[PDB]
Amino acid sequence: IFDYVIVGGGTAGSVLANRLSARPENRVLLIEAGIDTPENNIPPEIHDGLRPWLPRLSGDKFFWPNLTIHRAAEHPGITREPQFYEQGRLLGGGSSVNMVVSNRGLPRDYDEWQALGADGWDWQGVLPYFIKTERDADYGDDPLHGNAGPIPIGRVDSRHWSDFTVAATQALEAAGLPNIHDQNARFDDGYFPPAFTLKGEERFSAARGYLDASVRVRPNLSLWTESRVLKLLTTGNAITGVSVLRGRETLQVQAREVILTAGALQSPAILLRTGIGPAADLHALGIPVLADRPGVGRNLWEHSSIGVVAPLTEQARADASTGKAGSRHQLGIRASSGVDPATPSDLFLHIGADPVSGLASAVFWVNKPSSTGWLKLKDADPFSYPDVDFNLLSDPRDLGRLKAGLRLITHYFAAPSLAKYGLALALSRFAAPQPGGPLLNDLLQDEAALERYLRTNVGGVWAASGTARIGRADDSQAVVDKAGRVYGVTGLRVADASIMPTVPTANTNLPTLMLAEKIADAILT
Ligand SMILES: Cc1cc2nc3c(=O)[nH]c(=O)nc-3n(C[C@H](O)[C@H](O)[C@H](O)COP(=O)(O)OP(=O)(O)OC[C@H]3O[C@@H](n4cnc5c(N)ncnc54)[C@H](O)[C@@H]3O)c2cc1C
């Protein structure tokens, strides 16, 4: 019988399988639905870290195919449609298909988690785990940083910036923003070279860092790939195993503990199908109630995104080609919309230029939003995806933040070092930079068209989180305790981005690594 069965070998599941199997006495099985990515056969679309958008251009090969979501909140006069939402289906999960940035957020995010009932998940409580995961090439010997962890984190050198980047930084300085250098240990507003994870030009997923060739030969560690968990097995109020599809065979596997790391959209669907969820929703589908947990699938967080693109004028194109560090990430911007003063540093922006597509871009997102959504089962079948409603821009502050970021963009591009390029900025969906949207200067004058455009075209940043949140022992909307244990049953934990009480002011991979390290420590102690 396995001591731990870990469902989903993504970012979190990779950490948990490594840390829990480090004790020889723990017999650990990690199950992952997608392909393996062993060192001798990492697919090339995955392996190319300098082109980390590559997986998104190979259609659904590396993702949960036809996983569709509703994005923006329903609103009068707009007909929304289901949208494909990319989630990794392969060892390493999101870390195998992501944009390779590695950032922590801000102390306030985690102090918030503790204020909302996650005891010991304040900044002081999470920092050691941010330190444990990382090996920072630039600042690793400094306080607040790690120099020994499995996940490399580095930045491009300022001196290697393209003339286009330099020009954008001058525009930001004219707007009063300074270079803060280290977004992971300096927490006021400003711009910086983004921290990212790469091994030279190679992607370096959680699978490569936590499931390395030595880990894989641990005799107490079993790894099943192309293996899909269908259902949790139960005995009374204990979870006691899983049922697994491996090819055309179904297998039962006993476990002392099952840890769900199936991703923020799919972990809570497993919980619902197991009968852990809002009792009225479960009755509605004839699913026996094991525990009435009204928080399951609620509290769905995301980062709300939009793009701006312009054709590259000759000067801009030339300026864009002078960088000395290839197509790595060059520039990120942390800023305050001022919409709700209770939430500083609520915007993340990037300005860059791509000679290949021939476009300059200013993409950004609401990095600390106010809206949340939810997901529910469509039906009881184990193969169905959940019905997901991100409900973006349901809180009007988020709409105000989108408009403010667009005005910021206008301001930066009005500064001399950017205005000299003569770029004609137009709107675009965030993840599809392309022609077709209106001019930014024209749209901003038309309040009703602006709002309609934003509610129609708002996107996410793959930051799905919060659907099985940590919370206090007496809180009926909490799903798991401070160690990931699912309230109402035994033998079951959740330990992926589902457990975040709120989305951080951060892309979610590094906070996921951190939370997985913290949960693993809690289990082990
Ligand atoms: C396209 C994309 C770009 C991104 N860009 C970045 C970025 O640059 N930086 C950043 O910090 N974050 C970014 N993110 C987000 C970040 O990578 C995710 O938040 C993180 O991977 C979440 O980790 P996780 O363990 O919760 O889920 P995942 O890594 O998604 O892992 C869940 C795993 O569970 C498996 N699984 C699910 N159901 C079953 C089942 N029934 N049986 C067996 N296995 C199952 C999956 O196949 C998957 O491998 C991006 C994500 C995407 C998708």
Swiss-Prot record:
In what way does activity depend on pH? Optimum pH is 8.0.
**GO MF annotation terms:** FAD binding; oxidoreductase activity, acting on a sulfur group of donors, oxygen as acceptor; oxidoreductase activity, acting on the CH-OH group of donors, oxygen as acceptor
Q: Name one Pfam family in it.
A: GMC_oxred_C
Activity as a function of temperature is given as: Optimum temperature is 55 degrees Celsius.
| Record field: catalytic activity | 5-hydroxymethylfurfural + 3 O2 + 2 H2O = 2,5-dicarboxyfuran + 3 H2O2 + 2 H(+); benzylthiol + O2 = benzothialdehyde + H2O2
Where along this sequence does the record place binding of FAD?
11-12, 32-33, 64, 90, 94, 98-101, 229, 462, 497, 508-509
Q: What is the effect of changing W462A?
A: 39-fold reduction in catalytic efficiency on vanillyl alcohol. In contrast to wild-type, is active on secondary alcohols, such as (S)-1-phenylethanol, and is strictly enantionselective as this mutant has no activity on (R)-1-phenylethanol
Would the keyword Oxidoreductase be found if you checked this record's keyword annotation? yes
EC number(s) on file: 1.1.3.47, 1.8.3.-
Under the heading InterPro entries, the entry gives: FAD/NAD-bd_sf, GMC_OxRdtase, GMC_OxRdtase_N, GMC_OxRtase_C
- Cofactor(s) listed: FAD
Q: Which PANTHER family match?
A: CHOLINE DEHYDROGENASE, MITOCHONDRIAL (PTHR11552:SF147), GLUCOSE-METHANOL-CHOLINE GMC OXIDOREDUCTASE (PTHR11552)
Quaternary context: Monomer.
Other notes: At pH 7.0, phenylmethanethiol is oxidized to the corresponding aromatic thioaldehyde, benzothialdehyde, and no formation of 1,2-dibenzyldisulfane is observed, demonstrating that HMFO does not catalyze the formation of disulfide bonds. At pH 8.0, two products are formed, benzothialdehyde and benzaldehyde; this suggests that the thioaldehyde is slowly hydrated, yielding the aldehyde as the final product.
Q: Which family does it belong to?
A: Belongs to the GMC oxidoreductase family.
What is the protein's given name? 5-(hydroxymethyl)furfural oxidase
**Organism of this sequence:** Methylovorus sp. (strain MP688)
